[PDB]
Amino acid sequence: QIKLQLPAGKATPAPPVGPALGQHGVNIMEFCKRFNAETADKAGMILPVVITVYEDKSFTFIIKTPPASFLLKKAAGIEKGSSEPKRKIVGKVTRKQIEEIAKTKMPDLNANSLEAAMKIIEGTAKSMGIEVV
């Protein structure tokens, strides 16, 4: 069982994909087209998928919501997180934005309340030099 974060509508490259699971038994081509199939509904974003390979080299994979750090980057309109979180703020997002992301990632979050969800997201923002306003 392998896991990785592949961009929406794109796959097959050797450096990014290939070698990775391609060395566990997986047949790249089938995944590239397959992944890029459903990753059509949500394109442009980087989404993490969990590939599972059965003894017979066959496989399946679940597509999850994009990473918090990623959504956060997007929200703050930045490209990278601070090189020194807290010491240097490189961006910021509104409390409502935290709410949006928390809502977006909810299926993958284990919070029992939207409040707890936002607290989770804020923890990530605090780790990448992104402030909340």
Partner: peptide, 17 residues
């Protein structure tokens, strides 16, 4: 920049043993 089995971003990795 080269090897067999051993990196994440250029292209080698592994492949026997």
């Amino acid at each position: 920049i080269a090897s067999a089995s051993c990196t994440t971003x250029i292209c080698t990795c592994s492949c026997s043993s």
